[PDB]
Every structure is written in C-alpha cells, then in structure tokens.
Amino acid sequence: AVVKCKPTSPGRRHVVKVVNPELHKGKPFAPLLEKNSKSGGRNNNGRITTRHIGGGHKQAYRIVDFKRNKDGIPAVVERLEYDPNRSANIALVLYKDGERRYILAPKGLKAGDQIQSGVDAAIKPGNTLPMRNIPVGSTVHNVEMKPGKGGQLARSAGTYVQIVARDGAYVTLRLRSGEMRKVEADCRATLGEVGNAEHMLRVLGKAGAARWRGVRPTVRGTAMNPVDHPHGGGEGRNFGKHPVTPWGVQTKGKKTRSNKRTDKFIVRRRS
Template sequence: MLRLGRTALWHTTKVPTTTALTKNLLQPSSLWTRPSTTATTATTTMDSLTQRMSQLRFYSSKTPKNPSTAETAAKANAKSDTTTPTPSFISGFNTKGSAFTTIEASAYPSQQFKTKKPTTPGKRWLRRVPRDHLYKGKAVRSLTVAKRSSGGRNNSGHITVRHRGGGHKRRIRIIDWHRREPGTHNVMRLEYDPGRTAWIALLKHEETGKLSYIVAPQGVKTGDKLISYRSLNTKTTTTTTTTATTVPLSSTATTAAPSSSTITTTTTTTSTTVAPTETLSHSVDTIKYNVGNCFPIKMIPVGSIIHSIGLKRNGPGIMARAAGTYGQLIQTAETGYAQVRLSSGEVRLVPVDACATLGAVSNPDHQHEWLGKAGRRRWMGFRPSVRGVAMNAVDHPHGGGRGKSKGNKDPRSPWGVLAKGGKTRKSPNPFVVKPRPRR
C-alpha cells in the first residue's frame, strides 16, 4: 500500500489540470506502462491506476438500482480488462495463487480463513479455518470413549502438570492407527475431533460394513475409496504338491518401479506360482497409489509424501499425525531401514516393514488460526500461565529482585532445567541420521 500511495502521489503532481483528469476518468485504460512526461500519457496512466484502485478490496456489496450509462461502460471495461492474464502489482494482495493472477481473482476476499463482523473485541481478532465441509452431527457413539479430566493432578491431588483445568466436556474418538483391515473402505464423511488438530474421516468397509475412524489426509473427500495394503499376502502353489500355503509378499515377490499411479507386482520363481489372495475386493494385480492408502514402507516409491508413519513392524502409526504434518521417503529397501525426512527437517531411520499412509495430514492452516480471546483458550481446557519474573524467588528461579530482573540466570524452568539452547538429552538417538536444524 505504501508503494501504491507513492505512485498515486507521483501522478497527481505530474497531471497538469484536474479538469482533463476528471473528464477522462471513465475512459478505457490501456495496460500498465512506464509513465512519460507528457500530459496525455500521464492522464492515461492515471486512469489505469484509478481503475485498478477501484478493483481492490474497497468495494461495496450493494449496487445502485439505476446505474448511469457511464458507470455501465466503466464496469464493462473493467470486466474486459480482467480477462487478460497480465501481471499487476495489486495481485500481491491475493492470498490464493501466485502474484501473476488476474485482477478479478485478487478483488474478492480470500476464503482461506473465516472471520466475523467485529462487534466485540473477541470477534475482531478471531480467525478460524472454514469448517463448512465437516459433518454437523455427533460422532459414532460406539467409536468414542468418555474422557475424564484430572485438572493436571495426580492421585494425591497435587498438581503435576501446570496450566490445565476446566474446558468443555469431550469424548475421545478411537482412531484406527494400524489399518490392518484389508479391502476397500468408503469415506462416509469428514468430522471434527476435539482431541486433535486434524480432521478425521469415517470409513465404512464395502463388504463387512465395519466403521472406523482415521486421520483424514489432505484432499480426501466424501465418497472416496481408500485401501489398506498392509495385510496383503500371497498364495503360493507348488507344482509337486496340491497343498497351498500362504507366505509374505516380501519373501517371494518383487515390486516393479512405479511408472504412473499404478504398479504391478510379478514373481520370478520357476517352481512356484504366486498370486495375491482374494481378501481384497478390487483387482489384486494392480496396486493403487492414491492419497489415503496405507502401505508398508518398502512398497512406497521413493520421494512420496507420507504421514502416520509407524516405528515397528506391526505397530501403529506414530509420527506425522498432527494437522499439516508429513514426511518424505528419501531412501528405502526390501529389508532393513528406510530414511524419512520429517517436516521439521530431521532425517530418521524407520523399519521398511512399518506402515505409512500416502499424503499429508489435513487442515494445514491450523497453525495460522487466531483464537481471538483468552476465553476461547479456557474453553479448550487450558489455564493461565504466569511468567517466572512475576513470581517470588521461592517460586521460580527468575523470581524476586527489583524490577524485571532474572537474577543473572539463563532461561530455565521452575525446576532448573535450561529452557533455551541447553542440551538435556543424555544419549543421542541412534535412529536419527540428521538432526533437525536448531536456532
């Protein structure tokens, strides 16, 4: 806006008379060009600047009942200008897309966050992610358990975790972190979970009709079909006998390199014929690498974005489960460990038999939300936090003294543990290949 004001001030000093400027305000303007010293060029560029200023967010939602002919012509000219995909400096105000979008796209307010009319101070600073696509009803009762809050106190009544207490009554949603159930699952709806920052998806098995909750990946919508390949087995038939035995896929089958969204599994053994079992309802010869499908890490192509990453062979998903988090598979093998780069920048070793889900976690704009007021924080079950310098010396290492003095001590917790920059890890984690960058 500072550059816009300077440009307007420069043009007002270059225009010789206001009569010619007022006369040609509603004339069609050309593309933005470098202004010259002549009065005609200055008038043309001023018309273009005035027209572009009118297309900013300073617009009114109400239109006059009887618009004049000049206003109708000006609107037609403005509409014709928006069809040309020319870059404009006011396109930078648009929060959706690049700066080289059309003027029409930047004229409307962004739908990334939902705000309210500032009738109160709490509503003035409220900025939430839209939740219009979420289910408005209650969760499935059988997939929830009651949450009994303790207020941060142990069985003796002593506060062991500070800044907790109060809040709305909630029920814990039981999430299927293992994804062992084979077959196709239909996404029934997306729901809000008060116990986590990401959205959750209600799945229904096509054959059994069993319901389950998972963390909704980004881009998954109602009606999608998700498949878990974690329990994918093969049936091996030997030519010398008539008995059939079931063996793991990793022991006999080899996985081809992915060339598109599908990948075909084949075998190279000579004496046995390997075919997938009929536990999957879809075509078992084709593996679909869609967002939301669960795989063992050894079946995922290198470079894929994954979340809900497990740390054990038959364990649940542990890492990358919060809103907007993800990891990237940078190295894998048939046996041993794979390397995954987390969103924090840390590179970690993960067993190739552990599970992972394709895609990133939903609700990535959660970190940019504004609660608006302290009361909304209390509704979430948090109590106020008191600074250490505001306490007495007996209550905190930063307390006591005159004024805002920390007592010449480094920032630390009430129990003396260094809070900024101090090393608290006694032994390094052997599974961390590259630690996250630190400040």
C-alpha cells in the same frame, strides 16, 4: 475456509476461524465413542505435573484406527467429522463387510472416495502400505515406528513425512522437524498429507478461547518471589540471572536429550 470476523466487540477484532462445511453437522458414530475424563494436569498422586492444564469443554474420545491392519478390503469415505481430541479431522469409512472405523483425513479426501490398505493397494491418498512397498521420494503420514503398534508420526493438522532413501530393511525419513530418522521397512504409512493446513492460521482472539481448549493461564516467573521461582522478584524488574526453569535448568539452548537407547536411527537431528 479462513474467515476474519468483524470488530463488533473487543475480543472479536483479531478472531480468525477455520470453517469447513464438509464436516458432519450432527452426532458422531456412537460405537466408536469413549469416555475421556480430564485430569487437570494431575497424576495418581494428585500432584500437578504438567502445569497450565485445567477446565475446557467436555470431550468424548473417538476411537481412531492408526494401524489400518484390515488389508484386502476396500473402504469408502462416508462423512468428515470434527475431532476435539486432535488437531486434524477424521473420516468415517465403511468397509465392504459392513465394518466402520475412523481414520485421519488427508488433504484432498472427500465423501465417496475409496481407500484400500495392504500391500497390493494403489498409490493414492488415503491408502496404507508398508514403506517397503512405498516408492522413494513420496509423501506419507501416520507412519509406524515399529511394525504392528500403529501410526505415531505425522498425525497433526498439516503434517507429513517424506521418504528420502531406502538402504536395507530400513528406510530413511525427513520429519516435519527436519530430523532425518531411519525406521524398519515394514512400518505402514498412509499416503498423502493430513488435511487441515488452515489450522495454523487459527487466531483465538481472546483469553477464553484458550480456556475452552483446557489451557490455564501461564504466570511467568519474573514476578514470582524467590521462594517460588529462581527468577524470583526484585524491586521493580531486575531479572539479573540466566534464564532458568523451576528446578534449575537453562531453557534457552541447553539440550536435554539423554536417551542413548536409539543412538542409531538418528542421522540429521537438526541444525
């Protein structure tokens, strides 16, 4: 649910929480936990590569099954859980054979609902089938891009893919970016939409709320001194040059895609 707190303190007027009591009020499944050490935006060379990464609350990694390769075995949802490593929630499923796994929680999933992956699976939210068996025009998420590697598209809070066409061994998809991409007709896709759509309405309300997420403050560049950033300085606020990143790139319209390896799966990139 969406909740707007009261202005009992400067730093709480504009806070907007996303509460869901259906989530588990306890510890998660331990066998599916892993250590997740924060990097601070640094690499094997110890140099900052991605700025504004640092701090944040300690997090343990929940092993999620993006493949759903256990076909022909039903599974029922036990409880919904909070996952800090992603924007969406996860679901603790129990297979008939006693195997437990985590999966992304769709829109209208609950506890006790059944799901089945494979080819003969029914067309209901939570089930997973190759897009070869998915009817055209439907909505799916956690889509594979190459058969066998696992879902890579539409994995965020309220994201979904819509199958719009099927030509041959390939199928066309409009992604949440509006891009029209085509992928092979053997990539598993979980039906439905990821359910946390009230996630975009979250308003942090204060600076610390960003530091809990592991986000360090962002310094613009206009006040930076010429040795530091092209925008540099100036007596007052001059900024009389073209917007540019550090290292000298525009950042205000210049397209920087230079892959040329796919060059086939793109149809209606955007615009």
